[PDB]
Amino acid sequence: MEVGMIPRVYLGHEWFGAERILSEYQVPEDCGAQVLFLGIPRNAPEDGGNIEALEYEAYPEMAIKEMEKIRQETIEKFGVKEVFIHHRLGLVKIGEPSFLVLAVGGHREETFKACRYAVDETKKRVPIWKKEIFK
Amino acid sequence: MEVGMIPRVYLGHEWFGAERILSEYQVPEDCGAQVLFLGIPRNAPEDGGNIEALEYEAYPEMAIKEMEKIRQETIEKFGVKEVFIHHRLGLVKIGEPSFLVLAVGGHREETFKACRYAVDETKKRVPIWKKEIFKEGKGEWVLGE
């Protein structure tokens, strides 16, 4: 995707990815910590080990609005400088990240907390659900 | 540079970087989470003035061994599948990562804990000495007679 600036909140069938975000985002002089979480579809033995991919769907408008709300809360609550919350829609192969959260802050203490908060809240409140694709 | 495999523990003047590591590393089928921490030199005016860079020095062998010990501990204590612990030596300009820790595991819970553990334990136990390299004009921040 070609954009003027990488969106902080993204929900779509395309993807920017950790490499591009980390490469393009300029860390502010007052920030000394970045904590990135990548959620990846698994094909663990406990699920049969026959999963080839996951298909993600959502209520697009509702989801992105709630995602932005969580981002706002994360920044205000932990005092970090920036937070990215991205999630893919459509087909996602096992091993490919489908969920991304990047927190940028002054120190690691609050940056780790910020990332974990955004990740946990997103899972509890954002309307995005998966479907397994077998074989 | 030094692939084949990227060394899980690395200490030197060169740098693999998060982009290359995330790009090359293949996530195992039983892993659903990756937690990456990047430590970056920051300008700390509360330390006397504006900083240009952070310098890191050490006796590599000793530092590397403790880093490897911490890595093994992280994997064992948290049950994660893989852990990378990298750190740069020499001068690192503000904004450029100098410390990297990547934990790969089954779920969020243990992966986050593992990364935090490796990071905290490294800062407490690994003998890498740091020095803030201030920009010219430091004497202007605190003025007496």
Ligand SMILES: [Cl-]
């Ligand atoms: Cl909607």
Ligand code: NA
């Ligand atoms: Na990614």
Ligand code: NA
């Ligand atoms: Na890096």
